[model samples]
Target chain A: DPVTNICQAADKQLFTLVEWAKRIPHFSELPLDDQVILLRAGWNELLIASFSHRSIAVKDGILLATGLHVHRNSAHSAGVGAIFDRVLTELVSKMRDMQMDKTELGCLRAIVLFNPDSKGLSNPAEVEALREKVYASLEAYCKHKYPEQPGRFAKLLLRLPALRSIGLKCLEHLFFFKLIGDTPIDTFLMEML
Target chain B: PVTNICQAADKQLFTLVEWAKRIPHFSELPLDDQVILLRAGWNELLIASFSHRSIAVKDGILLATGLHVHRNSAHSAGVGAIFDRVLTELVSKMRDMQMDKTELGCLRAIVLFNPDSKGLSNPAEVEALREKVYASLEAYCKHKYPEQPGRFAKLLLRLPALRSIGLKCLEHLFFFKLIGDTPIDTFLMEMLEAPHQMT
Candidate 1:
């Protein structure tokens, strides 16, 4: 039950994120294929970020979108200690120390989604311009909100590169492959994308 | 072990902003503009401070936190020697130039008010602030050290060298470890900006 339950929650939250994405201003206006590319490339970083957001607010444990609370003792007890190794530990600590709030999280997600490197799009120019707009807002927002913490903007941007280091294979393998058997996660997630 | 370095490094960087605020004109810049200059100029500014701090030590580089981190003192031991050497060389050069406290202060202010740094809300205003600091430093160098007629230009010439040394130290301190790197800029988090940064 625990095995499938973790991935089930992950799937539910991912769809919820997609729903959230669809609701972004001008997001729905993008052509369907381009939207898929952005989502496909960005979902892992988004999940990793949202994971940190939830865990910090929950204090001692990771609170899933479905209200499941995973603790170091309990979750790691189930032979999933690798989850902590791969994602939870460093990200949670950084986010916790940062006192990460919803506004920064939302901005980070938006920046991740409007990725210009998903350059397979017919409208690569539009995607590049949109990404510039989003990071500019993020920069201005950090300056406006955390002016005293001058390095905050650079520190947050650094996380993108840090989180990018985690491989998709590692994430999907730990997140779903063990429990979901041979169902390729791309196929499962792509069906919805 | 890393925490020790993190705390020390944090102390060093905090000194940067606190010293900056002491200058009357530094605080007059817009809040956003202050951050842009600090972010971009941190490399050079930090080296100037490091040079200032090196007045006492011979074998060890003294930290703002009072911990004297020697060459090869870090956990990963051997590689830090090169980066540490870069800092030591700058300090030696500063000693050669006989930079008094007043001149070092002006140099630090010049580095801190960099108009060339990106994202400044008003580059022109920043330029004027730096221009003042520059002429002041030039005035002092020429008046106080008459032997070296071009000491003002000579001192300014080393901004790149200072920038190079500080950047290498940044990598040595913050980025040495790989993706498998355990600590994620933890030391920088302390001095770079204190945080449980907003989401």
Candidate 2:
């Protein structure tokens, strides 16, 4: 490889993730600014949650949606910092370790996305209600889908706050795509956020 | 004249790429992102493109290159009869609706700008573009085809149906042989540069 190309494919997955969010029940009912704020806060967590499924079969690496296996060492060598990998590895590993199913992963993403803690919501209560709705949806889903498994819901609850550790700037470290001139992905993400 | 269905597939793909590249703002994406969309949406594009030209035919498929693969004959070529029937039904409905160029163009555009095509650089921008396309189609249906109440939604519904048939085309065409190791992008890049007269 000429250089690090991780961020290029990250778009594909994030694109899919955002579209998924648009369909969340009552997601569109919130003020437009509130919707943006929720996404700004939750996308990284959602991406990681989504990747947890793909990461399990790989060798301690995050599998970007494009199917590239990014080993921690390879990424470090590429100048993208090892801490990024180390931190993400554990986060991803925890979910993979749990061997969470599609519904759990999906529910986790929905619940994380409706965060009432996200600042600047015009109607924070609406956002809070959305979170409660999604949380209840997940709880009920877990009951019906995994009835015999005790504490599955509790196990899933443990994974949410860990997702919050993903910095708004973490994508800065995760991506390594070239921009026009000497610009960085930082500029674009800054604009996005 | 001689033809290989596989090579014909290449020409169709190359033309689709060229067309996608010409789309407003689509050219703005990184080349890598563009390729990702091309690869991800190529099947849907092909099915919709095929519908545009092949809507009138009921008896056989009009290959982009000049041969007809009849329903019964397509099976021997690895395309099952069920696939043929579904495609025929797809074509029949397009004909029944008399889908015009503007409507089909919007439909094809919607397929290419799939915000969910995993592996993108800036999906939010892609999502914005997709939203615009949807609104544009809805606007067009409202003004030009006033009597048709659900035309916009009806056409929107065809997206998943076309996607289903697109997968069937992939299963039959790409996987027909013992399928060798030519990365589809690399292979299509070569065909893209091939000297073919294209519209």
Candidate 3:
């Protein structure tokens, strides 16, 4: 039942991410399949990144899932434990340190979602163009929003690799960990990944 | 001097594309996917391949052009601060990893064959190919760094960094290419233009 709860929670979170992508300007202009690919490719990053906006506590190397104490063990046990820990501690700290506002977060999410590098695309160029627009918007947004922090954009962009690393490790754990077989990945979550 | 710099960039871009074409099974990909992978991964490959030659200090970058310029230097033209930092971090990270030729090649392939790119017609096939490259890279890391347990993860971790770097470069190319001041060649122009121009 706990695994079921986690699955439900993941599904909700992914739905929210998709909705967010839908709201970005011109996102719908992408072909339907391309939209699906971007969401799938970026879902993990966005999930991990969503933690930046919420309240969460770290205790004894465990992160309280979604700002609640309910899924600490499951979260820690899911990935290379050390990686999950680093992501919860180091990456969360970096996010807090940067103090990314809503606009920046939105733009960053769009950049991640519009990745042009994914294989088998019918229109990779259009995706790249969309990504470029987000990149420029983020640059401009940082300049306008954080006049005091000249390096804010770079710092935010830098967090992406760490988030991506965390996502990949989590994916590996999901496939390799025995607990995963018990709960089984839900269809929506599976498609997102 | 600017002409020389642009010419050098053109040459490097050609070499990178040529190298990507030579990757086993790269050409086997559909023409659309090949262009997608090339456009998406070229900047990452450029940094991964040329980090040894490029200089990245706090204040400036020395690209393959051998022309050293400040972070805000005019040679960067329409480039932004984030890109300068991206390049610096990429150089520093590559230096730290001390990635060898095999690892570099593997990383390039990993970047090239990403299945997650939007609009793929055969994502499952692309994913399968990416898996093979990942497996090969994992094995190579295991063999090369027998003492390090997570070398493969560390290499894979470089991917997001490469992605960030590539995006920054994409912005730079798009901006300059639009302004028509940079002497980006027809090939580079086509590469940059193909993604945005396609419907």
Best candidate per DockQ, number? 3
| Root mean square deviation (Cα) for candidate 3 | 19.9
- Per-residue C-alpha lDDT of model 3 across residues A15-70, encoded as one tens digit per residue: 87788888988888878888888888887777666654453344333332444432
Q: Report the lDDT of model 1 for residue B194.
A: 24
The 10-residue segment of model 3 chain A with minimum total lDDT is: A175-184
Candidate 3 predicts chain B with a TM-score of: 0.70
Ranking by lDDT: 1, 2, 3
| Model 3 docking tier (incorrect/acceptable/medium/high) | incorrect
- List candidate 1 stretches off by more than 4 Å: A1-193, B1-14, B74-76, B81-85, B172-199
Provide the lDDT at B109 for model 2: 85
TM, every model: 0.46, 0.45, 0.46
- By DockQ, the better pick of 1 and 3 is 3
Candidate 1 chain A vs. true chain A: TM-score? 0.76
Query: On residues A35-138, what C-alpha lDDT tens digit does candidate 2 reach at each position?
Result: 89988877776766666567777766666555656554432344345434543554566566557887777776787788654657787657656666666666
Point out where model 3 deviates above 4 Å: A2-7, A56-67, A70-79, A175-193, B1-47, B50-199
